[PDB]
Design a protein around this ligand. Sequence first.
Ligand code: CLR
Ligand code: CLR
Ligand code: K
Ligand code: K
Ligand code: K
Ligand code: K
Lengths: 337, 267
Amino acid sequence: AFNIFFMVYFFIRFIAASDKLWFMLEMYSFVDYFTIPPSFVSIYLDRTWIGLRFLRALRLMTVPDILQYLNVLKTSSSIRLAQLVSIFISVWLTAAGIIHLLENSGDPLDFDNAHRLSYWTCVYFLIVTMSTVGYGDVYCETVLGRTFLVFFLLVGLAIFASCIPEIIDLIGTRAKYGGTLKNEKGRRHIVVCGHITYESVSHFLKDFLHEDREDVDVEVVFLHRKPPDLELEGLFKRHFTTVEFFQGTIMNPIDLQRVKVHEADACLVLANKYCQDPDAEDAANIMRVISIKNYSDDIRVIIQLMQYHNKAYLLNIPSWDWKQGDDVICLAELKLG
Amino acid sequence: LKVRKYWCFLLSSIFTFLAGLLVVLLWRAFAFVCTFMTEAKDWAGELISGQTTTGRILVVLVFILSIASLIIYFVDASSEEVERCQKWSNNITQQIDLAFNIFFMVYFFIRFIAASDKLWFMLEMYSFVDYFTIPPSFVSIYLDRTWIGLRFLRALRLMTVPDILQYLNVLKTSSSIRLAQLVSIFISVWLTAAGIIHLLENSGDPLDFDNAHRLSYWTCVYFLIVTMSTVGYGDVYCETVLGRTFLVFFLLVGLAIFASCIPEIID
Ligand SMILES: CC(C)CCC[C@@H](C)[C@H]1CC[C@H]2[C@@H]3CC=C4C[C@@H](O)CC[C@]4(C)[C@H]3CC[C@]12C
Ligand SMILES: CC(C)CCC[C@@H](C)[C@H]1CC[C@H]2[C@@H]3CC=C4C[C@@H](O)CC[C@]4(C)[C@H]3CC[C@]12C
Ligand SMILES: [K+]
Ligand SMILES: [K+]
Ligand SMILES: [K+]
Ligand SMILES: [K+]
């Protein structure tokens, strides 16, 4: 019942083929040549043979094509991952079928040195070979089995060494920093963005959380684009109950929702004082204030500014209001003062 | 050993995980249809991170019994048999195991309170270790018989050593933190995988248990390092169906760990 469907599917593919000569030599059609015709012969002969039924595993390499036809796979990484997994599994299962047939049948024209091996033992034997472990508990004994193993060792080992490392890093690790900040009743928090480094965060947290000042239950939420390094991650661990970090940009309205800017007491924009171009640094920080004010107008913003002539741009923003608590800390004005 | 009660140990661990999973979901529904918790949640989170003086003691105390729990598992796996019945009062090893396990459940409860969301906490990797470790101890207490079970999961607790050292500010530079993470990950995976091989090979195939392969735990440790190095002497190899099945999955991922951790540890 399955084979008759595949021949009419083969005929449909034949009609759709642009050139018939190259279609007959296609890899997929070669699978159908050695699969369906044996079924009819076994029907007339009233006897069954395992034959080359292992070639059905080669049909798994068209799964990424099938998923792309239905638009299930969209991003490039998912397409690459699907191709590598499908190729590795199909080759692994097909090679195990070849070993299973050659070993169990025995040498041709005598068929007296048959080696009894289960198919799943051959699957286990194949993965030991591709990993280059080679226990030797299971090994090929027939001439044909060893002959195929010689060719497989040349090409099969390269597939394992190229697919598995690329599969692992493509999967990667789950995003450690992400998701929305959990809402709490009667909770006060501030959002700190801009120049977020280990030196800037540690210096800020020491001054912000000092037992010489009044005790207030305000927690700090950090938003930055680049993931933190190991030193910064350890610092956040030591302040687990009062400091939270999220990965994202203040210019993305989605990320502003994640950190709950509209519910924050104030937004603090740190600046890179040791920057090559003070004008470029000031322009980036000014755009951050515009993004925050665009999301909501009644949010207190405190921003570190590098040069005084850039202060006019912030003052000309319609939503900027010094009465409501918006402040500009100009390093050039304060230092020279 | 006429009838094996290993299913009772597995059923209780599955039931405990399922009961806790639905209770959290039911409590969310119960809360939906219907100040101390907030105060306790902040206090609990401060304790597990070792911010206060009592928090530092608990974090250090967690380190001490994490190694101790694994050590008593080594002497427990040295037994020739995997299943045996004995009075709990006769052996002092079971008594010490109970003393360590009761601490880990109250430590689990403290971590549960400190958790921001309870649903994701129940699915955490660390909590999965506690699901299959402590509930079997109580079942073995009532059944008056002991089983090796999944006690090898205690080695997974070693991956929190870098977190413990970071809580106490022992690790400061980035290189030391990276080195601690790689060493802890490699050792925990190596010891856990050896425990899986030791259990599967010694127990035998399920529902028959007649093809058991007698292997010591340290032989499995030696077998694992030969596998990850891709040397494969073949003097020691898996014979059971379940043992080979796990080896197939380990060869896909375990070999990558060795090839990525050891070169990075050396330099
Ligand atoms: C594309 C064509 C020309 C390639 C050559 C045809 C191939 C596929 C055919 C022709 C001869 C056939 C082989 C003849 C003899 C044997 C030995 C038997 O115990 C297993 C099958 C096996 C190994 C056959 C496999 C398929 C085979 C190799
Ligand atoms: C997270 C949950 C859903 C995963 C599935 C539950 C797992 C952990 C449980 C359910 C069935 C259990 C298995 C049932 C049978 C056996 C065979 C026995 O000789 C060794 C233990 C072993 C191998 C058990 C290991 C643990 C097990 C696999
Ligand atoms: K090798
Ligand atoms: K070898
Ligand atoms: K080898
Ligand atoms: K060998």
